[PDB]
Amino acid sequence: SNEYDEYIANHTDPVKAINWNVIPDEKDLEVWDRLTGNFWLPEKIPVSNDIQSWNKMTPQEQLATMRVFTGLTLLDTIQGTVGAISLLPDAETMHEEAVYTNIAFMESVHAKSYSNIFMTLASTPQINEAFRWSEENENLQRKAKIIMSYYNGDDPLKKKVASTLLESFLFYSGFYLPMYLSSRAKLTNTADIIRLIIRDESVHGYYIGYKYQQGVKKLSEAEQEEYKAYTFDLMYDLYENEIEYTEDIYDDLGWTEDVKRFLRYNANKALNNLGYEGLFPTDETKVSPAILSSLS
Amino acid sequence: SNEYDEYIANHTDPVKAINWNVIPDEKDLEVWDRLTGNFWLPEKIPVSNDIQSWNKMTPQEQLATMRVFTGLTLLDTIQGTVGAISLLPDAETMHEEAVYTNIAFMESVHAKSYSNIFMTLASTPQINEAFRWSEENENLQRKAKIIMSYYNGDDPLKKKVASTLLESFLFYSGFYLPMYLSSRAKLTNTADIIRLIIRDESVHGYYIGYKYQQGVKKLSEAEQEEYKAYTFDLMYDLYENEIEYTEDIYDDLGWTEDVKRFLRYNANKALNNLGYEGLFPTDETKVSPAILSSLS
Ligand SMILES: [Mn+3]
Ligand SMILES: [Mn+3]
Ligand SMILES: [Mn+3]
Ligand SMILES: [Mn+3]
């Protein structure tokens, strides 16, 4: 008699090894190859060349930078240690599971990258202040716990919706500030780290959104419209919360109206990644041209 | 605004962002830096240069290669999609959680590496035969399910024992075949992939063993003796199962006696990684010098 006897008795199917010689879904390999081929670490960018421009930024500019980036750090802490991991048990293929392990690791790299920027540029009180701020900010804690409630729930398709909205709407909206500052010749090296993150996030939201589309299409037409209604209700909830977050972060700098156009731009893109038309008319999504061009 | 108000009352602590400016355990950063600095993909090695060498191998050498490597594939499929992931919720630091996301990813890299070798060198029936064999082999299924029983249980320390025995004993013992062949100038490019895997496995077993030692030290003497007895019983159980596996894989080739010495060598190292003296006298662990050196 062994402690593992009941486990084995209740698990009679074989444990399987992943076989890359048979690929049920070619997209899994395409995305594996793309994401692994894009591996990077923040140390490859010389953020220390941003010390001059950081020191010339205003107190309001530096405060917004600390808070936006600590919020992003929070999101990718969640996405690497809880979100991507939560998608593994529901994978359609073993190759998709392998892709989620890459995504979890790269989210840790993303999260670390913000500390590399902070440790190079910011003061010790500034860093401590931002982390304590992030733990008490009601809008940031609310968006985090809303997304995590789906990761910790038992509906696989809702986890993929939550993930895609986190990546394509919440995280993408945080790219406003580095892109703005870089188009003004500030924090230009930090923006290069952000572009590496964007190069990953673009693929993450497309791929998990693709998997969501493939899953919901297996359902009845009535069940599909129930998932679409769920998605639109959650999107609008997160958008309203993001409006408040945005006013609080950007009102003093005066960037709020353009960031709100960017929110609507990114909300439509997140819905598109899930196979749905946008919640906003296109002419409400006109973020300034530099921002978009700065993305790449 | 409804679906998650019970979630929040069950989850009242703040969600935290990882902060790499404060490191409670410097080992977490040292291992992060080592493992991420050692990133590799199997396409970096010219395994096609091994085609002539493979073609000159006997049917018995090819069969053993296919079977050993498919069992290693199984182990790292488990380790990357179940094992490392199971350690995250028990982590003492957020930096340790980040490390486990790298380990999970790199176990997927390891697993894929065996397919790269197979797809380059072996025939399609050989590959199919090997994956079906792995699903039905009683010793390979038994060792997998015993380890998984701990990943799926509720005892954090037992997960770390299981993981360290998987890495430092089960996986390491599979390195015999590629090291032997390479010492005989066969499949030498394949052996360079295996050396990259060993460079990672060496760190994984050290680090998770370290975390186990730190955790069991926090316990009373009585509880520490209980975990040590648990560990020795599980090690000898896995050892007996591995003896049978080894006889079946290596008897035809005639390598069995030296592989068994390597089993005891690796059993003692796995126990050392967990803070314990060995189950075998050191003179029972004299694997041939060639193997030890080509390993490294
Ligand atoms: Mn990310
Ligand atoms: Mn992402
Ligand atoms: Mn491995
Ligand atoms: Mn390992």
Side-chain angles (χ1 to χ4, degrees):
Chain A
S1 150
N2 318 278
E3 162 176 38
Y4 47 73
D5 288 349
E6 202 217 8
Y7 179 87
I8 296 193
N10 281 278
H11 292 82
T12 56
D13 291 353
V15 186
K16 298 177 298 194
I18 186 165
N19 182 356
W20 287 83
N21 189 54
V22 182
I23 305 290
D25 192 336
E26 86 180 357
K27 194 66 223 162
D28 295 334
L29 178 63
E30 300 171 21
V31 172
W32 174 267
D33 283 347
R34 182 169 274 325
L35 293 183
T36 55
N38 283 164
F39 174 77
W40 60 278
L41 299 166
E43 288 82 7
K44 87 135 138 177
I45 298 297
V47 174
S48 59
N49 281 173
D50 285 351
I51 287 171
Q52 178 174 186
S53 66
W54 175 257
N55 282 338
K56 278 161 192 160
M57 287 167 56
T58 71
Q60 300 84 0
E61 284 167 344
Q62 291 186 359
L63 185 63
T65 300
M66 298 300 303
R67 291 181 168 182
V68 168
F69 285 176
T70 301
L72 296 176
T73 302
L74 176 59
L75 296 183
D76 269 0
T77 299
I78 292 158
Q79 190 74 345
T81 61
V82 181
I85 295 192
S86 76
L87 306 181
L88 292 267
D90 312 320
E92 272 322 289
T93 67
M94 302 177 74
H95 320 91
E96 174 187 351
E97 296 179 44
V99 173
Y100 295 140
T101 65
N102 170 268
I103 293 174
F105 165 58
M106 291 304 296
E107 305 294 4
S108 294
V109 174
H110 295 176
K112 187 167 183 293
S113 294
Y114 298 108
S115 281
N116 280 45
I117 296 160
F118 292 164
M119 291 176 60
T120 302
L121 302 181
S123 78
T124 291
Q126 272 177 134
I127 298 173
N128 191 251
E129 284 158 1
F131 279 90
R132 296 290 90 71
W133 162 87
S134 69
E135 287 153 25
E136 308 165 31
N137 179 267
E138 72 303 358
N139 291 297
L140 180 63
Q141 289 294 315
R142 180 166 199 58
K143 72 186 85 169
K145 290 189 177 170
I146 286 165
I147 299 300
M148 288 171 86
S149 78
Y150 297 111
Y151 293 157
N152 284 127
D154 70 26
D155 186 317
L157 291 171
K158 292 180 178 178
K159 300 179 185 172
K160 295 179 168 78
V161 171
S163 184
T164 302
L165 294 194
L166 180 146
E167 287 178 320
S168 301
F169 175 63
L170 297 178
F171 210 103
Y172 250 84
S173 291
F175 297 138
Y176 187 93
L177 174 142
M179 294 304 114
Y180 186 92
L181 290 170
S182 186
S183 79
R184 273 83 179 164
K186 300 154 194 201
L187 306 188
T188 64
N189 296 286
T190 292
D192 285 339
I193 289 175
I194 303 308
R195 289 177 179 118
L196 290 163
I197 294 177
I198 294 161
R199 184 174 67 176
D200 295 337
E201 194 72 294
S202 188
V203 175
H204 296 174
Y206 154 77
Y207 179 65
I208 293 161
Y210 159 81
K211 293 284 178 163
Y212 168 77
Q213 289 183 58
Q214 152 183 102
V216 79
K217 271 244 21 211
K218 292 177 180 176
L219 301 186
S220 78
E221 205 67 31
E223 269 212 75
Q224 293 181 43
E225 207 103 65
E226 287 175 11
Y227 275 106
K228 188 177 185 164
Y230 155 78
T231 295
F232 285 3
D233 290 359
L234 172 65
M235 176 71 249
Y236 206 77
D237 281 4
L238 287 170
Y239 173 72
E240 287 182 310
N241 185 70
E242 199 68 14
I243 288 283
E244 177 171 17
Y245 182 72
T246 297
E247 291 164 349
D248 290 352
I249 293 291
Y250 295 104
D251 276 349
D252 280 348
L253 288 165
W255 308 351
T256 299
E257 289 316 302
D258 199 35
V259 181
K260 287 178 179 196
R261 288 186 291 269
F262 195 42
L263 297 189
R264 290 184 284 274
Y265 183 91
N266 291 332
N268 282 1
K269 291 296 169 241
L271 291 172
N272 294 167
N273 278 340
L274 291 171
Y276 302 135
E277 72 293 338
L279 270 182
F280 300 105
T282 295
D283 73 357
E284 292 174 40
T285 65
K286 293 184 194 187
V287 68
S288 57
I291 291 292
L292 286 200
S293 86
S294 273
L295 292 189
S296 59
Chain B
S1 310
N2 253 192
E3 255 213 57
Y4 33 67
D5 263 278
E6 168 162 341
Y7 180 80
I8 295 201
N10 272 131
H11 294 87
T12 62
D13 282 344
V15 190
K16 293 183 304 191
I18 184 162
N19 180 358
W20 292 84
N21 192 47
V22 180
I23 302 288
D25 191 336
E26 74 221 333
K27 182 164 313 330
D28 299 328
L29 180 54
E30 299 172 348
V31 170
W32 173 268
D33 282 348
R34 177 79 64 90
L35 294 177
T36 54
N38 284 344
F39 171 88
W40 60 277
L41 300 167
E43 294 73 15
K44 290 165 187 221
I45 301 306
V47 196
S48 58
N49 286 358
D50 280 354
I51 289 175
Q52 197 227 210
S53 176
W54 172 265
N55 284 354
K56 278 136 57 195
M57 279 168 58
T58 60
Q60 302 96 299
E61 286 167 333
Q62 286 188 8
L63 184 64
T65 299
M66 302 296 307
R67 291 180 169 179
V68 169
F69 286 177
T70 301
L72 294 184
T73 303
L74 178 56
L75 296 178
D76 266 359
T77 300
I78 294 169
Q79 195 65 3
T81 64
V82 179
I85 288 180
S86 81
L87 305 183
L88 291 268
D90 310 318
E92 287 298 306
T93 69
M94 298 179 77
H95 317 92
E96 174 186 352
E97 299 174 30
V99 169
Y100 298 137
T101 66
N102 170 267
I103 295 176
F105 168 55
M106 288 305 293
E107 303 301 6
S108 297
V109 174
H110 298 178
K112 182 163 186 296
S113 290
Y114 297 109
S115 280
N116 282 36
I117 291 153
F118 289 167
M119 293 169 58
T120 300
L121 301 183
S123 70
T124 149
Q126 264 176 325
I127 300 178
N128 192 68
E129 287 155 12
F131 280 88
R132 298 296 82 77
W133 160 91
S134 69
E135 288 152 20
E136 32 179 88
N137 180 267
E138 307 292 72
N139 298 115
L140 183 61
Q141 293 293 315
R142 184 145 180 99
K143 73 179 94 176
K145 291 184 184 182
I146 287 166
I147 297 299
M148 293 177 78
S149 77
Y150 293 112
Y151 290 161
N152 282 292
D154 64 358
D155 186 317
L157 289 179
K158 295 180 168 187
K159 300 178 183 155
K160 295 182 169 78
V161 173
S163 181
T164 305
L165 298 183
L166 177 149
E167 293 200 304
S168 300
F169 175 63
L170 297 177
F171 211 106
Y172 245 86
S173 298
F175 295 144
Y176 184 96
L177 174 141
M179 298 297 100
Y180 182 97
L181 290 174
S182 185
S183 78
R184 275 58 184 187
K186 297 175 183 192
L187 302 192
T188 48
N189 298 103
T190 289
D192 289 333
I193 288 173
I194 302 311
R195 293 210 242 288
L196 294 163
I197 298 169
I198 290 163
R199 186 173 72 172
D200 297 332
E201 196 68 296
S202 184
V203 177
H204 298 172
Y206 161 71
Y207 178 66
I208 292 162
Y210 164 77
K211 296 282 177 164
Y212 170 80
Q213 289 184 54
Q214 305 287 99
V216 87
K217 269 200 348 107
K218 298 166 183 188
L219 303 188
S220 62
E221 238 23 55
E223 299 172 278
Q224 295 186 217
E225 270 309 297
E226 292 188 23
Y227 277 99
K228 186 173 185 169
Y230 157 77
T231 295
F232 284 0
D233 167 77
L234 177 58
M235 179 65 254
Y236 205 79
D237 196 4
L238 289 176
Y239 174 72
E240 287 185 308
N241 185 72
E242 192 75 10
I243 284 293
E244 186 167 27
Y245 186 74
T246 294
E247 288 171 4
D248 288 355
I249 291 283
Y250 294 106
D251 275 356
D252 282 346
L253 285 167
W255 304 353
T256 303
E257 300 301 336
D258 199 38
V259 180
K260 291 177 171 188
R261 289 192 290 266
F262 193 44
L263 297 190
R264 292 183 284 275
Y265 177 93
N266 293 331
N268 277 5
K269 177 108 25 143
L271 294 167
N272 295 341
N273 283 344
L274 294 168
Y276 300 137
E277 74 291 345
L279 240 27
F280 303 99
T282 294
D283 79 353
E284 292 185 29
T285 72
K286 299 188 199 195
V287 55
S288 59
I291 298 286
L292 277 203
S293 66
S294 78
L295 198 70
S296 146

